[PDB]
Design a protein around this ligand. Structure first.
Ligand SMILES: [Cl-]
Length: 190
């Protein structure tokens, strides 16, 4: 629900968070979240066609940290061309053309100015290996909050510099933040 999701952004802003993220398929929803305190606007392209047009509008509106969630490297490339600077990928990307072709293609983009790769997983080893191969942002997606907070904590101890965590509940996001997460993704897509 849009109203409740926006409220999560607002409460996190009131708590002092400065790297709030917001995930939606709709640029108008993302623009409102931006107004309310979200700095990272995640365009959800997971089941949509030409979702890079959402990136185009957000670019026009003046947002500077637009992310694009896709496991299709050609689609991520087009999103980058349309103004996305954070490319959010997962294990599903290595599905097609095995031998890191997809990963390697997103790595070519990472060499383009401030372009960053974010890798999401619910699996610790997956996340660690993605970090080793050059992921800039590590999104802890385990739904066992106990396991997720242990992973946020260990990433901090191991020196990961941009740990992210996703929830539909600002209270969980605040707990992740306290434990070392810097990027707090409000995600009411479910
Ligand atoms: Cl995401």
């Amino acid at each position: 629900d849009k109203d409740e999701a926006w409220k999560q952004v607002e409460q996190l802003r009131r708590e002092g968070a400065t790297q709030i993220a917001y995930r939606s398929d709709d640029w108008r929803d993302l623009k409102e979240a931006w107004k309310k305190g979200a700095d990272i606007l995640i365009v959800d392209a997971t089941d949509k066609d030409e979702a890079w047009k959402q990136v185009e509008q957000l670019r026009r509106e003046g947002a500077t940290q637009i992310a694009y969630r896709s496991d299709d490297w050609r689609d991520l490339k087009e999103a980058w061309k349309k103004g996305a600077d954070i490319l959010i990928v997962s294990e599903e990307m290595a599905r097609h053309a095995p031998k890191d072709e997809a990963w390697k293609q997103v790595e070519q983009l990472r060499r383009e100015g401030a372009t960053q790769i974010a890798y999401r997983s619910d699996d610790w080893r997956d996340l660690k290996e993605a970090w080793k191969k050059g992921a800039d942002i590590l999104i802890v997606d385990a739904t066992d909050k106990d396991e997720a907070w242990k992973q946020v904590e260990q990433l901090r101890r191991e020196g990961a510099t941009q740990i992210a965590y996703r929830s539909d509940d600002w209270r969980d996001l605040k707990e992740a933040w306290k434990k070392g997460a810097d990027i707090l993704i409000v995600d009411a897509t479910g």
